[PDB]
Amino acid sequence: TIQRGYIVNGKKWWSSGAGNPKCKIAIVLGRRQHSMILVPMDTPGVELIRPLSVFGYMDNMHWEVHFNHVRVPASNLRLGPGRIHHCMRTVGLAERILQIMCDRAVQRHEVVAHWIAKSRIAIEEIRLLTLKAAHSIDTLGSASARKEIAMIKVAAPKAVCKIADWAIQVHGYPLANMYAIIRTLREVHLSAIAKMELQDQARRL
Amino acid sequence: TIQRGYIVNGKKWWSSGAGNPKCKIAIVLGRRQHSMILVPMDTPGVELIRPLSVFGYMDNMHWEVHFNHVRVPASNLRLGPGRIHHCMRTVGLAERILQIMCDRAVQRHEVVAHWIAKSRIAIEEIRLLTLKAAHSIDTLGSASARKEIAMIKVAAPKAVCKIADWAIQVHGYPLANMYAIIRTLREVHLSAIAKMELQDQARRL
Numbered sequence: 375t376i377q378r379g380y381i382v383n384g385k386k387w388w389s390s391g392a393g394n395p396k397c398k399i400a401i402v403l404g405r406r407q408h409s410m411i412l413v414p415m416d417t418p419g420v421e422l423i424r425p426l427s428v429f430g431y432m433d434n435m436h437w438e439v440h441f442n443h444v445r446v447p448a449s450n451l452r453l454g455p456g457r458i459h460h461c462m463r464t465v466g467l468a469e470r471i472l473q474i475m476c477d478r479a480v481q482r483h484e485v486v487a488h489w490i491a492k493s494r495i496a497i498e499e500i501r502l503l504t505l506k507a508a509h510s511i512d513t514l515g516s517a518s519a520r521k522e523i524a525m526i527k528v529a530a531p532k533a534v535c536k537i538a539d540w541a542i543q544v545h546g547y548p549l550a551n552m553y554a555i556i557r558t559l560r561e562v563h564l565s566a567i568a569k570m571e572l573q574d575q576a577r578r579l
Numbered sequence: 580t581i582q583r584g585y586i587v588n589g590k591k592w593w594s595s596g597a598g599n600p601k602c603k604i605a606i607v608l609g610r611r612q613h614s615m616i617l618v619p620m621d622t623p624g625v626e627l628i629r630p631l632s633v634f635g636y637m638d639n640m641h642w643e644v645h646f647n648h649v650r651v652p653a654s655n656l657r658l659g660p661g662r663i664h665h666c667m668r669t670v671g672l673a674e675r676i677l678q679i680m681c682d683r684a685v686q687r688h689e690v691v692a693h694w695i696a697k698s699r700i701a702i703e704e705i706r707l708l709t710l711k712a713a714h715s716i717d718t719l720g721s722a723s724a725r726k727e728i729a730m731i732k733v734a735a736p737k738a739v740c741k742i743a744d745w746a747i748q749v750h751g752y753p754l755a756n757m758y759a760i761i762r763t764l765r766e767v768h769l770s771a772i773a774k775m776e777l778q779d780q781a782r783r784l
Contacts, residue, residue, distance in 0.1 A: 429634055429635060430634060430635035430636050430759075431635050485766060554635075561690060
């Protein structure tokens with residue numbers, strides 16, 4: 375609730391980076407009810423509830439937040455670059471994972487070679503998609519690249535998780551942290567892409 | 580090394596259940612070099628090295644073992660039932676996971692229904708395979724059921740891991756422990772099955 379000064383009483387969840395000692399500001403876009411208002415965490419009514427663990431890693435480098443009727447002044451009141459960078463970092467992680475798995479395979483069959491080849495193919499395809507989306511954002515404005523953004527949001531995590539699984543299978547180590555990150559970062563976007571594709575086909579005809 | 584009393588100097592790894600305070604006996608089948616000899620853990624030279632963590636779970640319910648020239652007398656010197664039970668327990672775990680996922684899906688689309696149906700199909704097929712292998716062991720001796728044992732060793736973990744992934748995806752809880760167990764319990768058996776199948780085809784002709 376962001377009901378009108380204005381009061382914001384509600385319960386947060388999965389708020390990444392909420393446990394840092396140097397975390398003061400906080401941006402909440404809560405209930406055309408979309409109205410994002412800054413809320414300092416030192417204000418009364420804000421209190422961290424409990425830490426959330428993913429696969430048993432505390433992720434010291436996901437504490438729940440509760441906002442019980444915080445009083446803030448009216449003064450205290452997009453996704454393209456974020457998605458692009460969040461896909462590029464994952465691509466780099468997958469490249470490092472593939473390097474590690476190749477080195478381990480050499481140090482210690484046909485199936486491992488097939489796994490390496492498939493991983494390289496997937497990495498190249500995902501990198502090309504990410505760069506195409508970034509260039510589309512750069513050149514032809516930022517409102518004409520939602521389709522590519524949804525596409526890179528769909529494609530990358532599945533192939534990267536598959537690569538991580540193949541690597542940890544070959545291993546039978548930093549790869550643990552990479553798998554943790556890839557699993558943490560892991561189907562409505564497919565419906566959105568289908569809607570956009572149908573609209574495009576209707577427009578073309 | 581189990582070289583001939585006899586001395587057994589070597590390093591163990593991934594020894595499950597080695598950290599229990601009530602763990603005294605130990606069976607090691609080390610270097611027709613297959614000669615399994617009991618080795619009490621209180622004997623000099625046996626010392627636990629470090630605990631092994633899988634996905635960041637200590638599994639209180641995998642400490643490394645080191646045997647540095649343990650002196651034991653000569654007095655101190657199959658897999659079918661083990662594989663059958665290890666597949667049956669996994670099948671039961673998958674059934675409970677499917678029950679939990681169905682209850683959560685009801686409490687909170689077509690894709691979830693498709694996931695439920697596929698999970699049920701896989702569970703039924705795996706249960707049938709396990710029961711067939713067990714009955715083959717029971718009736719026609721224990722030396723004529725290696726093929727089915729390898730088959731159940733191949734089939735079950737993949738489908739059960741897929742079911743666990745679908746469940747944790749639907750969830751967006753005991754399921755964490757189930758996923759931990761299914762991942763911990765997760766390709767040479769395929770080659771063995773191919774060899775046995777080729778031998779059977781050659782014999783039939």
